[PDB]
Design a protein around this ligand. Sequence first.
Ligand SMILES: O=C(O)c1cccc(Cl)c1
Ligand SMILES: O=C(O)c1cccc(Cl)c1
Lengths: 500, 500
Amino acid sequence: MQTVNEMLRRAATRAPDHCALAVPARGLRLTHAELRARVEAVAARLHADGLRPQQRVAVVAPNSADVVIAILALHRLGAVPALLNPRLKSAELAELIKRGEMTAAVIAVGRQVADAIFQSGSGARIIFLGDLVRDGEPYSYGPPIEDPQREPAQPAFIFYTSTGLPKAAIIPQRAAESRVLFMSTQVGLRHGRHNVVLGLMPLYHVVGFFAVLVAALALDGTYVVVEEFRPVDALQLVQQEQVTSLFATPTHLDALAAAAAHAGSSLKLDSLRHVTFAGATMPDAVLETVHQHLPGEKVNGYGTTEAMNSLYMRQPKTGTEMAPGFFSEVRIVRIGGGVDEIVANGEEGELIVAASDSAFVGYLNQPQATAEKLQDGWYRTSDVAVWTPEGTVRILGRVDDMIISGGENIHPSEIERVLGTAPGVTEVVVIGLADQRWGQSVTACVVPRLGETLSADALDTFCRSSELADFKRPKRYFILDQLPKNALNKVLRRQLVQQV
Amino acid sequence: MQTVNEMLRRAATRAPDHCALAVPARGLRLTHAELRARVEAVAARLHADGLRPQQRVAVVAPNSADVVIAILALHRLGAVPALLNPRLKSAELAELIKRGEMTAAVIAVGRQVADAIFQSGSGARIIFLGDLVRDGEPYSYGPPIEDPQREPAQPAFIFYTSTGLPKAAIIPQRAAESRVLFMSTQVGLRHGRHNVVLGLMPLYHVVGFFAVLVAALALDGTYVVVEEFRPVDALQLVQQEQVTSLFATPTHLDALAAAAAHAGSSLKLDSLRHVTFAGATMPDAVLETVHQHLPGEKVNGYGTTEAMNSLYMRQPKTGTEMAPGFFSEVRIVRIGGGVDEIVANGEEGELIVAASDSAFVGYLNQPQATAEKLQDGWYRTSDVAVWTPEGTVRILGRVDDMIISGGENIHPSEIERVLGTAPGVTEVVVIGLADQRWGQSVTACVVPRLGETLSADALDTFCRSSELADFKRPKRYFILDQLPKNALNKVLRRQLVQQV
Ligand SMILES: O=C(O)c1cccc(Cl)c1
Ligand SMILES: O=C(O)c1cccc(Cl)c1
């Protein structure tokens, strides 16, 4: 195999004096060589404090040079970093560290979340990030440390997914490579010092970590650190930094396209060759501004924390329609049936992908969840798809959001995309109320633009003019001043239902 | 890991009805699906005849659809294909199969080489290629067969290198992937059905096999079969077939460039994006015509049967100067010293590369050769290199050809490139005679162009005007009507020496 440490280390030997990390704001640059030295020194410093290999350690921090150093230093020691979204509720992070049986937690959130841990229960050493690394500068003690043996199926890193409370997906050693290389086979990145990769994706997301951070370094390139996203600022980075590739969320891309469109030839974005994104949920409108207004080849990708990348499209026409590339094997089976029950072609079903090398090896301490998800060699996405006559896979929506109304499959995502273009709608979620006509009644929950009124009549009329087939039209509307959302801004479908 | 079988099989599921193999002459095309079916059927047919997994089987045949089918069918059964240059002497092939303890030999050479085996000694079943597959059509019996378990370090394929009698390098299961993917990280190939790969490299060479055949299929592309190389014909294939990438020997590239230059816009070569080659030995003159006259990005690569790819250059200025890319780790140590004795920067030494995943695991039944070559984690190239101030590696020549004259390192390849431009020289080899001034005397052996005379005086004078430093100039000349060469056209340096 080739592990993360080994990928980064080989790079450092090929390009020791080349720029590895930049923070244009803060004015900090480290070569690959210098980043070894800092990773090494931390690794042994933590080692000198008791931490041994295979012990899980939490990392709760916004993107920064210092967290890149800390995460890699932990991998280099042999520890298993558990990367956690810093926007989670204090209570939730503590629960996931207790459930996690974790030896330490590296934190750069504030004093009040360190308190949450102080109580909480689980004896996990609370390490302040700035007690390890500040502005790329470690405080290091002890001799340098040995490189532990790593085994292909051995746990390497822990990323979190998301009913209630995110699950800790275990990423084995053997998975790093194809979690990086798919950026090359699918997206088109090649090895080389021209590589300048803008880090807009958070590091607690596998894409932000393997596909953006590790890729950048392992291709002997430069990771440009982005502590805080701002659309015009970010475009200045592309120009100033010679960014060659960018992997962004749909929301970022909307922002960047809108700025690019109101910069004009003002910004030189010529250096940028790859605009990548997971756009299954990307509305047609946003995608379009992306082709009109941003440069470089656009690639749409579908992936999961559990299996990384499973489908893609060069130069996408719509964001839902993709096709498997290198490393992947995929199938559409009957919902709730065995992994061998393929569908008739054109019937809807569950997207399952083969659980090859890139696959997670289970959820930490949730072997029931695991057995719902890894079956007879496959990984079950929980997403609904259909095969297009065109030979491509069309992702329709989550199995869990699917509305079954009078023996018929309805996907709220479709209906939400139409309704979201109705004038006066700022936000919409479609749920299936419990439930008649029967089984389930298609219902729309909509939030008006500031100061505007909506009426059920006018939205209905709008829907009537849309392309939706009869049965897909909402049977009811609730105009709300807002939708209840979690810590990470996801809509609480289970809960909204109750409230209506 | 991802094995060859598994790479090809996944492809077949992604692109079942896409063209896998073409033979434009012969008018034959097989989709990926159809190629599974034929690989499957052979595999079980051989299986039904006694052949079980891990048993070595010889393959002696010029490039053709049928040998692609046969080699893959053997891998699919579990057998270990030993691929052998068909231009070897009857006697030599037999010796390598006896030494090989091989269970069968698949042959498409003539009746007289089958005789060589008939005698020879080793009880190895002589299978005629056309007894398995003719024009993509198998004669198959028995039920389909089980897919054997394959293990990362387990032998997978056997390729031959070349003093006397080629060594059988064992290629483990785990090596296929990065032997393919380096075409993507270094050369720039991406996954996709646009991929149309011209097979000019012989299949008994690892590049011809992993980097060209397996790459083409595994990227869901098309391998264009070339039974017999002809420069204009081959350029017609690029145009007619929409060839996107081409990996060629230096001799092929000279031929193709010269034809391209005397076609002109006559041939549309636009579809061709990658012209790849191993050009360490490529004269400056030929490389230049390649940039002037052929399209697509040109990439120079350095590799070995033992470790595959170890250095490269996009848009090369000279063919000797390269730099390591993804998967590689390299060092220049003192000649004949330990793998840790790096050289002072600017001093010449032996190029060693790390023996990672892509590495062979030893020479079949030659554990002394193996221990000369795999040391303390490294693979020893037997090539001399130097680090350029520019941060690149300059390959100077084979350790074995190096001439040591009065305590000074002389590389005949350098002196041969100069002398080969002297007017009237058709062919030149520089050796070091035994040996004074001392140690060794630099001597040139030259063959005149048809009907021309050479004299030692005139060549000397030519050399005097060249860039060569004093000590590099030949001290003697022997004008010969030809050089003694082996079966595979390599010059017999040991032997020439005797004759002079
Ligand atoms: O979480 C995602 O959307 C994701 C995860 C891995 C790979 C890709 Cl393309 C997308
Ligand atoms: O044998 C060669 O020249 C060779 C073998 C493997 C890879 C490459 Cl780039 C070259």
